[PDB]
Amino acid sequence: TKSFSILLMGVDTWEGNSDSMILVTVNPETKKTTMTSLERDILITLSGPKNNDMNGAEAKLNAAYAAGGAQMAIMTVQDLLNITIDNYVQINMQGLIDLVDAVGGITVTNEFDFPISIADNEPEYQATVAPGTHKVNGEQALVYARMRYDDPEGDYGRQKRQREVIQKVLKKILALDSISSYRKILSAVSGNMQTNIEISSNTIPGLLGYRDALKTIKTYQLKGEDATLSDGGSYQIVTSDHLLETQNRIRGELGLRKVTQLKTSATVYE
């Protein structure tokens, strides 16, 4: 019954590439969970083992994972937000499909006037989401989550959608009453999910002591301005203003002191 922080990472497979970085704050006391999406494109100074060539390099946040696995991603995001992160959870795409299936599916709304597909690009995922509101399986949930319009305005939507999927999966998990139910869900994702959190017969029930925090899930996005790179690629500097409100929002939920200055490994305009 204490507030804790977890860094959620989707990974194309445990070395591979970060497809998502969500900081989740769980407060059982306030009965509130916050999910803040961190832009893969933010420019930042990476933090890793000193053993590592990329420790100290200024790069996009996406690159922490690519250089030193989940260890570097945590070190890097710790220095981005000036808060200590208690645990991490990597899931890959098979993971995400298995999990959505294991909770009985979810309901999403395709806002557009055309079905959503990604097979043209990635033919391993031939699923599709009709327009309107429909119950969706794991294969259809991944596709909704991974669809990028490949526009400067692509991730923003992709990130809202990724958050949605997780939130909806989490609402299904609240409504579970059995420990077996939960045991079956950790079975379902066994191969395709990895974490600091201890998984045993000891912990599956210890976990249900936090379900109360799923009663209110507020979603958020850390953002700034889209700029250009010499290769023609795209990055984003964080407006120091937006950055602090973000460290303070999270710190609050995690039961901590509001900060006065802005200590960050990130590259602000100033």
Residue numbers in the entry: 57 to 69, 78 to 334
Excerpt from the paper describing this PDB structure:
In this study, the structure of the LCP domain of LytR protein from S. dysgalactiae subsp. dysgalactiae was determined at 2.80 Å, confirming that despite low sequence homology with other LCP-family members, the overall structure is highly conserved. Analysis of the electron density maps suggests the presence of three sulphate ions at the surface of the protein. No electron density was observed at the active site that could correspond to bound substrates. The structure is composed of 8 α-helices alternated with 12 β-sheets in a 3-layer (αβα) sandwich architecture. The characteristic central six-stranded β-sheet is sandwiched between the α-helices and the double-stranded antiparallel β-sheets (β4-β5, β7-β8 and β11-β12). LytR LCP domain contains a long and narrow pocket located between the central β-strand and the α-helices 3 to 7, near the N-terminus. The binding site of LCP proteins is composed of conserved positive and negatively charged residues: two aspartates (D68 and D83 for SDSD LytR) coordinate the Mg2+ cofactor and are present in all members of the family identified so far, except for just two cases. The positive charges come from four conserved arginines (R154, R210, R212 and R222 for SDSD LytR) that are expected to interact with the pyrophosphate group present in the native substrates.
The LytR-CpsA-Psr (LCP) (LytR - autolysin regulator; CpsA–capsule-associated protein A and Psr–penicillin-binding protein regulator) is a family of enzymes responsible for the last step of the assembly of WTA and other cell wall glycopolymers. LytR and other members of the LCP family have been described as pyrophosphatases. They cleave the pyrophosphate bond in glycopolymers precursors.
